[PDB]
Amino acid sequence: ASATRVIQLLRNWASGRDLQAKLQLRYQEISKRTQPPPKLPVGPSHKLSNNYYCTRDGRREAMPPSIVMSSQEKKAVTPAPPIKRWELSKDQPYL
Amino acid sequence: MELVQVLRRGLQQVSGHGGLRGYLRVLFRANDVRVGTLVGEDKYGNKYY
Amino acid sequence: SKVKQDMPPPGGYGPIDYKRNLPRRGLSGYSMFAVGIGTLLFGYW
Amino acid sequence: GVRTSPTGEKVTHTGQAYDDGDYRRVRFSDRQKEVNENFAIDLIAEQPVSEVGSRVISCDGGGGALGHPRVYINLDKETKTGTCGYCGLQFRQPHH
Amino acid sequence: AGLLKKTTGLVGLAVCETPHERLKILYTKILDVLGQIPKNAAYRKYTEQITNEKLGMVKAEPDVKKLEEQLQGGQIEEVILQAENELSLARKMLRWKPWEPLVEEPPANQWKWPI
Amino acid sequence: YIRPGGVHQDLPLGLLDDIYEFSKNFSFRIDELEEMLTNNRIWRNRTVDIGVVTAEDALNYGFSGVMLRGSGIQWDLRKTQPYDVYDQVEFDVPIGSRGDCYDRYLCRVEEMRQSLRIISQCLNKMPPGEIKVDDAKVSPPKRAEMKTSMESLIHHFKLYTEGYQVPPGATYTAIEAPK
Amino acid sequence: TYKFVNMREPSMDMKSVTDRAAQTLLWTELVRGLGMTLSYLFREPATINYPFEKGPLSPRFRGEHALRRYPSGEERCIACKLCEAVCPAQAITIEAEPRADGSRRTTRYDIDMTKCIYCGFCQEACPVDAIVEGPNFEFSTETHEELLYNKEKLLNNGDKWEAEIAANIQADYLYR
Amino acid sequence: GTSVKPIFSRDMNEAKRRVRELYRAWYREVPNTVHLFQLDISVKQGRDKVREMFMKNAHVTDPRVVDLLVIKGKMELEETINVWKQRTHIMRFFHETEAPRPTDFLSKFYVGHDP
Amino acid sequence: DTRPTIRPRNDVVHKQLSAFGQYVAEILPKYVQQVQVSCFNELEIFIHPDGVIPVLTFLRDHTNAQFKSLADLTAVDVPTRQNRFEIVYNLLSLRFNSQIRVKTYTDELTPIESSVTVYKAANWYEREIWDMFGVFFANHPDLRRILTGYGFEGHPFRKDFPLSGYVELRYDDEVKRVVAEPVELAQEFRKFDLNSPWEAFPAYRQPPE
Numbered sequence A: 001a002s003a004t005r006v007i008q009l010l011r012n013w014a015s016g017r018d019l020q021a022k023l024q025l026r027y028q029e030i031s032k033r034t035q036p037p038p039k040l041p042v043g044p045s046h047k048l049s050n051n052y053y054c055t056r057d058g059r060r061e062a063m064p065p066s067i068v069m070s071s072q073e074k075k076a077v078t079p080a081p082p083i084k085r086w087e088l089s090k091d092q093p094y095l
Numbered sequence B: 001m002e003l004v005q006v007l008r009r010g011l012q013q014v015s016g017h018g019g020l021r022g023y024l025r026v027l028f029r030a031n032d033v034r035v036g037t038l039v040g041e042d043k044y045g046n047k048y049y
Numbered sequence C: 001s002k003v004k005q006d007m008p009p010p011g012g013y014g015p016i017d018y019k020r021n022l023p024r025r026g027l028s029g030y031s032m033f034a035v036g037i038g039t040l041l042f043g044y045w
Numbered sequence D: 001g002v003r004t005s006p007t008g009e010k011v012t013h014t015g016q017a018y019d020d021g022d023y024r025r026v027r028f029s030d031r032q033k034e035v036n037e038n039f040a041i042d043l044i045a046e047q048p049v050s051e052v053g054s055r056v057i058s059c060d061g062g063g064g065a066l067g068h069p070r071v072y073i074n075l076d077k078e079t080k081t082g083t084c085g086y087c088g089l090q091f092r093q094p095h096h
Numbered sequence E: 001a002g003l004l005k006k007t008t009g010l011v012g013l014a015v016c017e018t019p020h021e022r023l024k025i026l027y028t029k030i031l032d033v034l035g036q037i038p039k040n041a042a043y044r045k046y047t048e049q050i051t052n053e054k055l056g057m058v059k060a061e062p063d064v065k066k067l068e069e070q071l072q073g074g075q076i077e078e079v080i081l082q083a084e085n086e087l088s089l090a091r092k093m094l095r096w097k098p099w100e101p102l103v104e105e106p107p108a109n110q111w112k113w114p115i
Numbered sequence F: 001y002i003r004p005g006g007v008h009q010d011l012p013l014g015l016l017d018d019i020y021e022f023s024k025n026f027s028f029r030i031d032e033l034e035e036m037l038t039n040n041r042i043w044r045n046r047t048v049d050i051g052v053v054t055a056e057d058a059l060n061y062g063f064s065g066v067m068l069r070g071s072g073i074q075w076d077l078r079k080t081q082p083y084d085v086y087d088q089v090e091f092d093v094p095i096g097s098r099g100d101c102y103d104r105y106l107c108r109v110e111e112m113r114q115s116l117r118i119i120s121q122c123l124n125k126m127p128p129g130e131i132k133v134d135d136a137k138v139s140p141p142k143r144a145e146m147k148t149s150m151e152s153l154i155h156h157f158k159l160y161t162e163g164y165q166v167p168p169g170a171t172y173t174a175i176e177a178p179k
Numbered sequence G: 001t002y003k004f005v006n007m008r009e010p011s012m013d014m015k016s017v018t019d020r021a022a023q024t025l026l027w028t029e030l031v032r033g034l035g036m037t038l039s040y041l042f043r044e045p046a047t048i049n050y051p052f053e054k055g056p057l058s059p060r061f062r063g064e065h066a067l068r069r070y071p072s073g074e075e076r077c078i079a080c081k082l083c084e085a086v087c088p089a090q091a092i093t094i095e096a097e098p099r100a101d102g103s104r105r106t107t108r109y110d111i112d113m114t115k116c117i118y119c120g121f122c123q124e125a126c127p128v129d130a131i132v133e134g135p136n137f138e139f140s141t142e143t144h145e146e147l148l149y150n151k152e153k154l155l156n157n158g159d160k161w162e163a164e165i166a167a168n169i170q171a172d173y174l175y176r
Numbered sequence H: 001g002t003s004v005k006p007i008f009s010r011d012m013n014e015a016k017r018r019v020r021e022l023y024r025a026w027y028r029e030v031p032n033t034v035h036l037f038q039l040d041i042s043v044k045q046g047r048d049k050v051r052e053m054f055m056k057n058a059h060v061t062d063p064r065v066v067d068l069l070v071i072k073g074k075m076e077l078e079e080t081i082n083v084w085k086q087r088t089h090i091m092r093f094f095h096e097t098e099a100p101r102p103t104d105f106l107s108k109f110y111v112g113h114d115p
Numbered sequence I: 001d002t003r004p005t006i007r008p009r010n011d012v013v014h015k016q017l018s019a020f021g022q023y024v025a026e027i028l029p030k031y032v033q034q035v036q037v038s039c040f041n042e043l044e045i046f047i048h049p050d051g052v053i054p055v056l057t058f059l060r061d062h063t064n065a066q067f068k069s070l071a072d073l074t075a076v077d078v079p080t081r082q083n084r085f086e087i088v089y090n091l092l093s094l095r096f097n098s099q100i101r102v103k104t105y106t107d108e109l110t111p112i113e114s115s116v117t118v119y120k121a122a123n124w125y126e127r128e129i130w131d132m133f134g135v136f137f138a139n140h141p142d143l144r145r146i147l148t149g150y151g152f153e154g155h156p157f158r159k160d161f162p163l164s165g166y167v168e169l170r171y172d173d174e175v176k177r178v179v180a181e182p183v184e185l186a187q188e189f190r191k192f193d194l195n196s197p198w199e200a201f202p203a204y205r206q207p208p209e
C-alpha cells in the first residue's frame, strides 16, 4: 500500500496503469464484521384486516391445460410476432 | 530515504520479537517475522496479535 | 422499530468502470526501427 | 453425573452397556468410549422449581425468538408441578 | 439494395449478390410444387397465403434494404435460405400426405395426466 | 440460496458495500486478462481460426448460450425471453463475427464487463421488501413467527416433512446459464 | 442491444502497417506481457499464513454439527424428527424412547458426516434450534469410522463449541 | 392386439438368422480378446461361456424380444474388440468372487430365513 | 399485480399459442392426435410414433414455425399406461422466441426411427434414452452406452429399477481387480409416505371413476 513510492513507480510503469487507485486485496474499506441487528420487513399480506387465503391461491388457482382441439376464410398466424433486430449498443458499437 | 526507513523497521522487527531469540524462534516456528499489538491471551499460552 | 436491511446509500453507489483500459503506450513504429537501427551502427562503428 | 459398568465402561445417559463378552467391545480397546459426563436427566432435576401464581404461564424458555416454541402449560395440578414439554423445567403455583 | 454487404454477420452464411430475383425464382418454385398438392389440403391454403403474398413486395419493391422489414424475416441472405427449406419442406409432405384421419386414435386413456 | 419462492435469507448488513468495493476493482482484473492474453500471438495462434462452426450447424447441433453467440447467432435468453428482473436492466450481448475460438474468447471477456454492468444496475436499484413469498404453504414462516403463531408451526412442520404439493403438469423452464 | 467483439478495421496506411510490422518483428505485445507479470511480482502476495491465520468467515457459516442445550442444560432436542425428514442425504438417524422423567428425548442422534452434505436444512428444520452446525472445519480424521457421529459425539461437541455457536445464532437469528 | 410392428425381424426364423452370425462373431473373437486383454482364462471356457448367456434366454417366442437381445448382445462384442471395456468388465461375467450360492433346500434353511 | 403472491398470467401469448396450435392441427390431422396449451403459456403437440420426422421437419422448415432448436427429448416411464414410455421433444424458435413440446407413446418393443436427420443434435440424445429407459431408436448411427457403466445391465431410469441397483463394486485383493457383487447397503433407504390423505388442489381432481 507499505510499498514505497519507488517500486510503486515500477509497478505503475511496467503495468502501464496506476494500481494504487484499486488493488486486488482488501483494506479498511471493508464493512466491519459486527454489523448492527436488522429489522427485516414484514410480508405484504401480513395485515390482520381482510387477508383471506381464498384470495391468493397460487397453487389452487392453476387450471388444467385448456382443451382446444382433440382427436376424440382462414388466415396464417405465428406463435409470436417475429423477432425485432436490435440495434447496436449506443455505448460502444464496435469492439 | 525510503529504503533507509524500510531497513529501519527491520531492526525494529528484531527489537519487537524480544531481540534475537524471539526473531529466530518465530521465523523458524511460524515463518512470520511481523509484529503487531497484543490483543489477548487465553488460558493456554496461545498468544494472539 | 424502523425497517432495517442492507440498502444502498441514498445517492447510490459510485459509478463502476467497465471499459477495457488497455494501455495506449510505447513509441511509434518508425521510432523503434529508427532507434533499433540507431544502436546498430553505433555497434559497428 | 455418570455411572460405571462392571467392565468400567462408563454408561451413557441412554443406558447403553456392553455385556461381558460382547465382541463389539473390542473397538473401545486402545481407544476411549466417548461419553458425555453431563447427564441431562439429573442436570435439570436439581434446577429450582419456578413459583408463579397463575393458572396459565408461558414457557418460551428465555429469549423468545432464540428459545423454543412458546407453550401455555396449565397450572392447576397440585399433585405434581406442571412442566413445559420442550423446556422440561418445572412450573408450580404457590398454593395455587 | 445499395453497396453489397461484406458479411451477413453469420459464419457459414454467405452474401448473395443477386438476392431479389433469387427470392423470385425460389418463390415461384414453391408455388409450382404446390400445384401437385390437392386443393383441400390445409398446407396449400397456408402456402399460397404467404408465398405469392410475400412474392408481392419482392416482385414490386427491389431494394433488399427495405425488403428486410417487408418480411420481418431478418437478413435476405437467410430468407432465401429459409425459402429453400420451405421448398424442401414442400417436398417432404408431398410424401407424408397428412390430411387423412389419424393413423390410430390414442390407445385408451393414455393421456390425461396425472395418473 | 435460491429456493422456490425467492431466497432463503437476507443479505447481511453492509454486504452490498463490500461487493461494491469488489466491483470497482474487478474491471482492472479483466484488463489483466486481456493485456495478458488478447494480443499475445502465442495465445491467438493456438486459438484463432480454430474449431470454427457455421451458424446453421451450430443451431442444428443444439448448441446454446455463448456457443451460438460466438458464431454471430443473434440470440440471448436474458434478452429474448427476459426471466426475473432481467427485463428491467440494460446490457449489450457480445455477438461474435467469426465463430472460431477467438471470437468466443472476446465474447466471454465482454460478458464479464457486461456482467459488471448488471452488478452496478442491480446495486443502485435494490428495492426493499420481504425475501420470500407471503405464502406459508410454499415458504417456511419466519423463525420468530414459528414460535408464537400456531399456523406457522403447522406450515413449517408439513413443509419440512411432507413439503408443498406442486400442482400436476409439466414445464421446461429455460434460463441462460453462463455455460 | 448488442455489440460486436471482433469487427476489426486494420487501417492500410503506411503509418499503421509500420506498427504491425514493428509488432511482429520486435515482440512488442510479448514485451507487454513481460512488463505485465513484472508489475505483478513487484506487488505483495495474498497468501494467508495458515494455521497462524485462517480465512475470513461469516456468522452464518456452516461447518460441523453439534447438538446444544438450554441455559438450564437440558438437551434442546425433543425428537420431533423433523431434521431427518428434510435431510437430503438421510444422514440423520434417530429413535425416540420413553424417559424416566417423562421428557422423552432421543436415545439416538447419529449423523453420518460422510453422507451429510452441510446444507444447513437441519437448523431450519429444528423448531428448538437443537441441532445447529458449528463454525469448526478442522474435524478431519484418518479412519472412516470416526466420522459416524453419534448422540454422545454431538453432545460433547455441542458442549465444546457452545461458546461460539451461541453468539453466532445470537447475531444471526434476526436474519433467520 | 396380436398384430404388431417388426422392429427388425418378421418371423422367428430370421430371428435365429440374426442370432447365428452374431454367435459366429461372438465365437470368433475369443482368441484375440483373451490375448490382448491379458487374462488368465482359457479360450475354451470363454467359448462355452458364450454358450451360457446364449442359453438362459433361449426360451422366448416373441420375435421382437429375441432380436432385441440380438442388438443387446450386438452391443458388447465391439465394446470389447475396440478395448473399450476393461479386464474388470469381462471378468464380471466370469462370476468368481462370490461363494457358491445354495441350491438344496437344506442349504437355504441353514443359511437364513429367506427363500 | 394486486396479488403479488400469485404469479400473473398472460392471455396474449396464451391464445396466440392456441391459435398456432390449431394452425399445425389442421395441417396434419393424421398425426396430431392432441393439442394442449397449459396455464403457463406452454404448447403441447401430442403426435403418433410414426410422426417423428414429418412434424419435426415441418416445425423446423416452416415459415410460420421456424423451430430449429432441439431443446431436449426425454422419456416419462409411466407404468400404469399401456405405453409406458413417453418421448417428449422440445423445440425452440429463434424467430418467434417460443417453445414447442411434442409427445409420442411407446412400449418396450415398439421402435422410434431416429430423428437424427431432422435434428442432428439428437445424435447423442438417444444414446442415453436408450440407456436410462431402454427405448430403442431405429435407423440410428450408434446406440452405445454413455451413462451406464461398461457392460452394465438394465435401464436404471425405468421406474421398476431400484435406486441402489443390483451391483456394487469393491477392490478384491484375491484377484487384484475391482469386482461386482449383489448390493447390500450399510443402511436401507428409509422411504417416506408423505402423500397427505386429504385431497390436494381440486382443480386437477380426477373425475369419478
Ligand code: SF4
Residues within 6 Å of the ligand: G083, G086, G087, G088, G089, G090, G091, G092, G111, G115, G116, G117, G118, G119, G120, G121, G122, G123
Ligand atoms: S445439513 Fe443437516 S439436514 Fe442437511 S444433510 Fe446435513 S444433517 Fe441432513
Ligand code: SF4
Residues within 6 Å of the ligand: G076, G077, G078, G079, G080, G081, G082, G083, G084, G094, G125, G126, G127, G128, G129, G130, G131
Ligand atoms: S434435533 Fe431438533 S429437529 Fe432433530 S429430532 Fe431433535 S428436536 Fe427434532
Ligand SMILES: [Zn+2]
Residues within 6 Å of the ligand: D059, D060, D061, D068, D071, D084, D085, D086, D087, D088
Ligand atoms: Zn418451555
